[PDB]
Point group: none
Chain length 81, copies 4
């Protein structure tokens, strides 16, 4: 399953999150950390100390990190089923 900024909110779901410890706990933390970073990225547009250009640049770059993380977490869960 590919992961983009646009499908992130429909793959990084509560249903998918609930779906072995040495794979459980890292992948969980990864999935979650992607959730917290994605949400803080969206809040850059609320920061009135950021220019429009800086907030867009930071948003895209942080969102990518949460996307690449979720891509990695899904890929690892899929190698383990």
């Amino acid at each position: 399953m590919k992961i983009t900024s646009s499908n992130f909110a429909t793959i990084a779901t509560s249903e998918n999150f609930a779906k072995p410890k040495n794979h459980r706990e890292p992948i969980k933390g990864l999935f979650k950390s992607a959730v917290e970073q994605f949400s803080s990225a969206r809040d850059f547009f609320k920061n009135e100390n950021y220019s429009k250009e800086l907030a867009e640049k930071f948003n895209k770059e942080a969102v990518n990190e949460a996307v690449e993380k979720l891509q990695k977490a899904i890929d690892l869960a899929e190698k383990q089923g």
Copy 2:
């Protein structure tokens, strides 16, 4: 509304969390913190039944006490958001 263990999960959803994002800062941030803390405490409480170092009675006791605390926090989050006009 009255939060209970039975209706917690129908209310502590990602979509109702996102409803919070329209609020101002001194409201949005504490309400979101309480909401998120409740959700995460409720979820760790589910994990107790998978802890094989817990007896059946200790896991059930722990799960009830943690869910009760999580329910408290969600009730406060909902009450504070509704005072600000949020409709869940």
Copy 3:
């Protein structure tokens, strides 16, 4: 023998704490009576500070609430002593 003069000497936190060793059927009733007597005594003079009560009525209420609190404390102490509490 409880009187209005010795009430404050006897109705102490220390004496109230002794009641915690009472068995349950006696404990909450005697604790409740002791505490109620203390609240009633302590608040007896409050009508003096209420501008809507004459001072003469305030003094009457003071003495009558005090008298009732003294009887209440006497009952609580007597019942506790019957269960072996030493004051």
Copy 4:
């Protein structure tokens, strides 16, 4: 004045409760009532330890949580009295 569990018994005194009598009428009994309620809640907070029907662990949790609430009550009472000019 900042109330804590460690200084509660030092501030919640009969001499400080006595200062409340010079309070104006609409503030006096409300603030005295909060003050007395805090003192009662603090003072009885350890009652569950003497109660054979409560686990010692539950009694300790109830002790701390009753104390924390009593501290907040007293703090409110002191703050409201100070706003009316009471010097403790």
